[PDB]
Amino acid sequence: HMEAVQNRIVEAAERVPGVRGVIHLRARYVGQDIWAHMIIGVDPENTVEQAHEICEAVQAAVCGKIRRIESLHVSAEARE
Amino acid sequence: HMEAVQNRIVEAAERVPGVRGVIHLRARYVGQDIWAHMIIGVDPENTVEQAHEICEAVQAAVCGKIRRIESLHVSAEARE
Numbered sequence: 227h228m229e230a231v232q233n234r235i236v237e238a239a240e241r242v243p244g245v246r247g248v249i250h251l252r253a254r255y256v257g258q259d260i261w262a263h264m265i266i267g268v269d270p271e272n273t274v275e276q277a278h279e280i281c282e283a284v285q286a287a288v289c290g291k292i293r294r295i296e297s298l299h300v301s302a303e304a305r306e
Numbered sequence: 307h308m309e310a311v312q313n314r315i316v317e318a319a320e321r322v323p324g325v326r327g328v329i330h331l332r333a334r335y336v337g338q339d340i341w342a343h344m345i346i347g348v349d350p351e352n353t354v355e356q357a358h359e360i361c362e363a364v365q366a367a368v369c370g371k372i373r374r375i376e377s378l379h380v381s382a383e384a385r386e
């Protein structure tokens with residue numbers, strides 16, 4: 227069941243403007259719910275505020291598309 | 307499990323240009339796979355060919371977003 231969900235999470239995150247791939251995704255079931263931590267790539271010349279905005283947009287996109295996610299943390303790293 | 311999938315099918319179909327709602331959706335599991343029949347609404351002033359094109363686009367959209375669907379038939383009815 228988990229691989230199909232992880233595929234949906236990556237696909238959803240990579241559709242958000244400013245995401246330069248999903249660098250890392252760790253998802254685990256807590257019961258029927260998913261809790262996940264994500265690192266996305268961003269343009270190194272983005273501001274820290276812009277990177278924060280992208281992470282928030284990823285959280286909204288992924289949580290809106292995948293109903294079973296009850297916790298999602300998104301961080302950013304420079305990617306070239 | 308099925309209600310979440312049916313919600314995804316309707317949401318995916320209603321995002322296609324030319325769809326005037328999902329009129330009917332009957333989904334059933336065959337094993338782990340979903341087989342489904344859908345009726346979408348279309349503009350009565352569309353041509354039959356245009357309606358056929360919309361149905362084909364719905365099939366592509368839904369099957370592309372919901373990996374477990376192994377059979378999907380889409381028909382159209384005039385909706386006002």
Ligand SMILES: [Cu+2]
Binds near residue numbers: 278
């Ligand atoms: Cu903020």
Ligand SMILES: [Cu+2]
Binds near residue numbers: 358
């Ligand atoms: Cu044709």
Ligand code: NA
Binds near residue numbers: 275276279
């Ligand atoms: Na900004």
Ligand code: NA
Binds near residue numbers: 355356359
């Ligand atoms: Na046409």
